[PDB]
Design a binder for this molecule. Structure first.
Ligand code: COA
Ligand code: COA
Ligand code: COA
Ligand code: COA
Ligand code: CL
Ligand code: CL
Ligand code: CL
Ligand code: CL
Ligand code: K
Ligand code: K
Ligand code: K
Ligand code: K
Lengths: 393, 393, 391, 391
């Protein structure tokens, strides 16, 4: 009737700090950030590097990164030349989809240990020029962040304008979004001060010929705020009756996250103690413009599949693509906002698009208390979302 | 214990013709070719579009294609907005890896029907300019085909130069390579004129305003050859004792392929006759320069895994990245040349890189006789290969 | 010293090539070399006699260092020859001749070459120095940016023409009739062999290809009279007058004159073609450049006490059909004496070359004793004019 | 008519800014307007008296149509003022003065402005028109392609300087000593207030930021004498001599002079600063440009019948320290009379401007009755020189 599958466990979840656009980590390619997160995750797992059998990494903006970004990140982390690698693109959901797909390989018994995560260096995303002849009168070379990353293909508008569309329908006003945003910055600061990212974040040292070293040991974005200015900001994506601003939207960022995943049997063989069990996951899709609400349906799928209720979830991570998205999800699901993005999120910590889906699973892994269920969901351009249920061990 | 998995069958396999670089299909983006193949596959399968639950497309050079290439391809094929999509990058192995990952989802019982394949428009791959301050003395605009597609990161040389290195190691000379190349063109012409791609390839109508419609109904590349010229050509990747020429290497091309995959149970439910069973698959990786021999190890893994012998394979599809690669594989596996790439391959038909791993699997599906085993393998930049074993139903 | 008299000893040019057309493979400086060599040959003097060279050239971006020096050295003139490149927009080729004449008048040199050169086919695009702006980078076309856009008004030259069409009531049908007349006159002149002494052929050499000899202007054949009244108004969509047919085109070409003092011409026993009588620049409100040649022409006439009736042949550069009509309207001159063998609307307009071409054409076409007046407008509101008398 | 006497009535310049430095937000034409307006104000004449303007400007790409016209109209001069932009590479700013003097000598104008302008900070990159080559392309830097690369040898100006250093045995240490000397002289002259009638300040305004007043040259402070002997030889790896310290730098600036006939100065009740006595251009093999100024200077001296000893001060443009040393050696002049208040190695070298700056500096620094001689080399193998006498 129903397939009998291997049990999948998370043994470590590690990330770089998230750097701001053109900021602290901007000199480092996405693949280098990948290598740093992958090397960190293997160290934290306490396993040999040779034990990693295969690697999948989310990475949305691959233009100009060179051949096989995941291979670059893996070989860059000192893993064996024998390690197969695949780079995954589900827009903002990439980092999560990588984990899901790796989980599926493990469930099939096709590998026993894998690394999965995401990486993005938005600072280093290039501009493009069409192949062919230059038209008389000039041409604008397009920005790949905008063209590939942030523009809905079908509506020919920015992700922000799609968010405005949801704001309208669900009556989610500027003040509520601004309040959510301030709250995210508040929670991010609290968490960092309380040392809530001790085992999760590893520092990166930026070495430049001549000048002194810079050690980046925390997320850069959450300190770039002025609470007084927040309600004074102009709406960036919609002038007429807008709600979304630079403050209450996610930002553009650099970072990478990696998880060591293995079967239950593998963890025993290697004598390592798992952090959490990956229970179920799902993808959902809606009209491209309606992506902010796709996480609702994805989350519900996962709950229905396992036969749990929203109340059974101790901790939710709903990616803060826009403050609007989180509020849209809180509204439709009817869940306790005190249980949502408790230690901050993409609005204040930043959103390296290919890594965020991995980061939020990594964070549940650490923050959950033994036995608790954690649910992470993440929307994506095109009308998609991914969700994942884990249980702490 | 080994998991108990669902059985996966191929119900249809369809592709566009392969267009030459800046040739017959150069006006169509990769995603549009994707839509044509996906629509083709579904119609050929004789199922409602709504039965397709999820889609994975291989696509190596995603820059400038717009957000979520697979979503574009899927929605462009008129599939429901409810259909989740993911774009896969394992370089030249992408089209096969997409099928593999879709198979793992089916095996897990996570979906019952999926579309998997590959797409590439090398004609439309753009040039790139780095973000940042313009360096004194000049700004480089790099060709993404060269930078992301064809250049080994680690050795900093063309794929063709890596091939030369294997030609050296295994003493595969210019004459043998040229002979293989002529053989490939010969087989392609024969197969095309015999009507052998009658159920595999669907024609493409190119429409230009004011111009007469062009119907591309067959592969463009195989007619672009002069056998007398073959031995005369210069070895374009190496000065001292070269072997690889434009004639005996694959070309740059445009095309897409798509397969409808389902569980044995779903095929029964939908009352469709499955074409083949997907038995096993594997990824192998070696030293980046040695990618030409990676398919040897991947095929060997698959054979060892299923407990089959090389002699048990009725038809081999070893992707013709370079004539060199096929010869190296024949050499190491000690297989019958007459059973390899029987109706031509990438040297004569062209190599839209994200598509080819899907095409060759689709070709075995149509070409195998009832009960026969077919093995498809494909190398990728970085030092990898994927391989798949199917059995005709 | 007293001021020296200046004579034109030779005047030569390449054919004019269409945009991305027959001469598009040759850089402007190479066209310049061809013209300069040809003029020296026609003058019948040793190259060593040429003391200094000035060339008009408007769009110098990407041509490499010192375009006039490249033209001169490329024509095999002595390394001792000083060179200067001149930019008065479309007036450049005439202003080079004027400034050369002044040097000769001062006794500072006795023999010079002056002319102009342009390869609009090879003018590049530009990217600004600095940081790439988020959201995209603009690559501007230097033809449009440096060549054809008025700085002050932020409009195309073609829109300045429309402005004059309004103020002087010069209609679309009138501009179209002028353009058709220009194409007619160019074809008639070419058929009659009127350019046999003025134009020298250019051989275009490509590796692995057979040589192509370009012996005549390309542009004047690119016309369909039936289509002329049907064309869209490209610079002003609504109630416009200027079109692709009735405007000058973008083109490649070079022209060069050998100039000497009367004393040097005698010393070298060459037969001068014409004497330079007077020249002048005028400038007006930037948008009103179409009428600047009227003032420039008036200045030269007044300078030497001649009346408009004393001019046998007028060359009023055909930047637009509108410009010539405006000049005829304001000066009230006989249209049958204006641009008699065609002009820039039909022959094309390599912008730095045209002001030299039209002086050179008068030098060949005028009959002994006749006066010719050449005038040419330029972006920014300028014009230059020159009066010569055929010897 | 006989040749008219030419006088310099004012000479003014912006400070020179470093590459991407204090004046980098201003286009060349705006620096031009500032210098022109300053020169006219200092002259004390109605601006309407200025009849025509020539400005040197080497790297014109992307500056928009008719750079000199933009500078002149931006300075508030009348729309009736004709304008021409001059390109003789680094000699441009001097050649503009020479050409304007020739017009005045002919009596073709009685008052002109002449000078030079350059914003190397704003010089763009270029992409060729046409289809993009498979495998990509490098967009060239116009400073490098048009400004600093010799066409014929396909090497940097700096490598041409190396050739002369080798031929004349002018060593690394001698070049460094000259460069330190220039920096020392520049600082001392700035500290003594020697530029108070020459340089006018520039206020740089950014909406949202406070005003920055640029009141002195930026470059001469960017030096560390202890480092000078440690620098790499950036144009030549083996046996090199030229470095960043002992070569001129890339810079932004403009200079403008008001020139009149002696009659016009009398008419307008103006007391001129200096008389323009003579000028000349010389040219040699392109690679040998460093020595062209020797020949240009010798021409002027021989023309007027002066000997080197009759010259009170020499301004030999400091394109490289090597150039000045080659000139001092070949001419056998007293080094204490050469570039007395610094030069391009330490003040910087906005290439279209420097030839005018050095003439303006002599006009201010010479004492009554003294002769000053300015000379300047240019890419392609040229030089210009000019002799003035202080009144
Ligand atoms: C919104 C976006 C375009 C940034 O806008 P921006 O205008 O270039 O951002 P800026 O840094 O110029 O900020 C604009 C203003 O907001 C202010 N601001 C920004 N963040 C702030 C904060 N946290 N608190 C207070 N003020 C803030 C700035 O000070 C600035 O004020 P100013 O106009 O007086 O100078 C970009 O971050 C974006 O597109 N984000 C969404 C990313 C996305 O869509 N991801 C995928 C999800 S589907
Ligand atoms: C080989 C490659 C660099 C193109 O080289 P190219 O020299 O620009 O190819 P061209 O079309 O200019 O062909 C060169 C010559 O070969 C000839 N030629 C090419 N294919 C031929 C054939 N099949 N039969 C006869 N002659 C042929 C052409 O006529 C041409 O001759 P010419 O010099 O008289 O014009 C490019 O196609 C490539 O990189 N291929 C490999 C792709 C790859 O690496 N894929 C991934 C695998 S890991
Ligand atoms: C006018 C200009 C913008 C060209 O415009 P364009 O629309 O790209 O010109 P095209 O070549 O595409 O011609 C457009 C149409 O006119 C037609 N056409 C052009 N010249 C024609 C002629 N002489 N007779 C008949 N038809 C003609 C073309 O066939 C084309 O027809 P189509 O739309 O059915 O295909 C350009 O030549 C220009 O800027 N000229 C002015 C140059 C200038 O200002 N110089 C300085 C003077 S101050
Ligand atoms: C020389 C040139 C290429 C600049 O070279 P650069 O290497 O990019 O110059 P930089 O500013 O990076 O200086 C390099 C080094 O020299 C040092 N330096 C430069 N000028 C110095 C000075 N005056 N004193 C001490 N040190 C100095 C810098 O500190 C730097 O040292 P670092 O490597 O420890 O940081 C450029 O200025 C040039 O082309 N000049 C010639 C212009 C020209 O040819 N004009 C026309 C004449 S015909
Ligand atoms: Cl999706
Ligand atoms: Cl791999
Ligand atoms: Cl010169
Ligand atoms: Cl003017
Ligand atoms: K924010
Ligand atoms: K081939
Ligand atoms: K025309
Ligand atoms: K210096």
């Amino acid at each position: 009737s129903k397939p009998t599958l291997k049990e999948v466990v998370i043994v470590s979840a590690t990330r770089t700090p998230i750097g701001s656009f053109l900021g602290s980590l901007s000199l480092l390619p996405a693949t280098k950030l990948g290598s740093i997160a992958i090397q960190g995750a293997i160290e934290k797992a306490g396993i040999p590097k040779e034990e990693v059998k295969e690697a999948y990494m989310g990475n949305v903006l691959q233009g100009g990164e060179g051949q096989a970004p995941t291979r670059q990140a893996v070989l860059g982390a000192g893993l064996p030349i024998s390690t197969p690698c695949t780079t995954i693109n589900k827009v903002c959901a990439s980092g999560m989809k990588a984990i899901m797909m790796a989980s599926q390989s493990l469930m099939c018994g096709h590998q026993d240990v894998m690394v999965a995560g995401g990486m993005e260096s938005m600072s280093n995303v290039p501009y493009v020029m069409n192949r062919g002849s230059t038209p008389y009168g000039g041409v604008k070379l397009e920005d790949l962040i905008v063209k590939d990353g942030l523009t809905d293909v079908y509506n020919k508008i920015h992700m922000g304008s799609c968010a405005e569309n949801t704001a309208k329908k669900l009556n989610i006003a500027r003040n509520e979004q601004d309040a959510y945003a301030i709250n995210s910055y508040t929670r991010s600061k609290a968490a960092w001060e309380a040392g809530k990212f001790g085992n999760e974040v590893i520092p990166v040292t930026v070495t430049v010929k001549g000048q002194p070293d810079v050690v980046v040991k925390e997320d850069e974005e959450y300190k770039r705020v002025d609470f007084s200015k927040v309600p004074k900001l102009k709406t960036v994506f919609q002038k007429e009756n807008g709600t979304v601003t630079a403050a209450n939207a996610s930002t553009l960022n650099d970072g990478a996250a990696a998880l060591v995943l293995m079967t239950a049997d593998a963890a025993k063989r290697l004598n390592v103690t798992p952090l959490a069990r990956i229970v179920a996951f799902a993808d959902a899709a809606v009209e491209p413009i309606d992506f902010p609400i796709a996480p609702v349906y994805a989350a519900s799928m996962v709950l229905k599949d396992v036969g749990l209720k929203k109340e059974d979830i101790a901790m939710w991570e709903v990616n803060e693509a826009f403050s609007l998205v989180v509020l849209a999800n809180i509204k439709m699901l009817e869940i306790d906002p005190q249980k949502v993005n408790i230690n901050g999120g993409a609005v204040s910590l930043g959103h390296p698009i290919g890594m965020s889906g991995a980061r939020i699973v990594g964070h549940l892994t650490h923050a959950l208390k033994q036995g608790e269920y954690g649910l992470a969901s993440i929307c994506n351009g095109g009308g998609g979302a991914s969700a994942m249920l884990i249980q702490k061990l």
